[PDB]
From Swiss-Prot:
Its cofactor is Mg(2+). Changing S52A: Wild-type activity. This is Beta-phosphoglucomutase. Induction: By maltose, trehalose and sucrose and repressed by glucose and lactose. Its EC number is 5.4.2.6. The lineage of its organism: Bacteria, Bacillati, Bacillota, Bacilli, Lactobacillales. Autophosphorylated. The record marks S114, K145 as: Important for catalytic activity and assists the phosphoryl transfer reaction to Asp8 by balancing charge and orienting the reacting groups.
Length: 218
């Protein structure tokens, strides 16, 4: 049986993306840039803070110095951190808590494998810290998804090889990272986005221990 589960955060454990959207919308309102809506935000998902800012500036074909860029980036960050103070246990996606309980009950290690700079804070606000054996620090990895580094680090951090692990991800780049780590990916979303050659569930309520076991056994 697999010895660990390696969890992406956004789109697996919770909708962290929604808070990034509101922070971006709020900054854009403050500086008078139109068009930062839910559909434009589709183009910010899995994008770095700085690239996301640039795409926002591009809505107004606006030109700013390196200092101004840094300062807008800083304000969005301030915004986001202020907004996530309201994260609570009700933000945890369906089925995830139950899965973490069942994993812990079966002594299966649990690690976070997220790019989020606020991972530990977010898990604590969702009351999930006690389930996590480790959080891979994205500041300590050389390369981001789709490179497997974060997953490798998460597995190592709980004292297993990636090959003893299942990885859960909602992104195509995250799926690649899990494959290239050696661990077994199970996506959530649609095969159109994630690939056709891996097991995929439609939503997190389908991530059960029994299902993970079946997939590992198959
Ligand atoms: F939390 Al993620 F890719 F959604 F690291
Ligand atoms: Mg994600």
């Amino acid at each position: 049986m697999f010895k660990a589960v390696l969890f992406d955060l956004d789109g697996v454990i919770t909708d962290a993306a929604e808070y990034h959207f509101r922070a971006w919308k709020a900054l854009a309102e403050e500086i008078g840039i139109n068009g930062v809506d839910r559909q434009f935000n589709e183009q910010l998902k899995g994008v770095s803070r700085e690239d996301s800012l640039q795409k926002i500036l591009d809505l107004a074909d606006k030109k700013v110095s390196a200092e101004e860029f840094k300062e807008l980036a800083k304000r969005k960050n301030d915004n986001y951190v202020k907004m996530i103070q309201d994260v609570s246990p009700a933000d945890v996606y369906p089925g995830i808590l139950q899965l973490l309980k069942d994993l812990r009950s079966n002594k299966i290690k649990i690690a976070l494998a997220s790019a989020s700079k606020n991972g530990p804070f977010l898990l604590e606000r969702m009351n999930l810290t006690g389930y996590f054996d480790a959080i891979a620090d994205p500041a300590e990895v050389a390369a981001s998804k789709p490179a497997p580094d974060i997953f490798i680090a998460a597995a190592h951090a709980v004292g297993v090889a990636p090959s003893e692990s299942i990885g859960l991800e909602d992104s195509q780049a995250g799926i690649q990272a899990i494959k290239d780590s050696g661990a077994l990916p199970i996506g959530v979303g649609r095969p159109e986005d994630l690939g056709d050659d891996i097991v995929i569930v439609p939503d997190t309520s389908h991530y059960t221990l029994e299902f993970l076991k079946e997939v590992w056994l198959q």
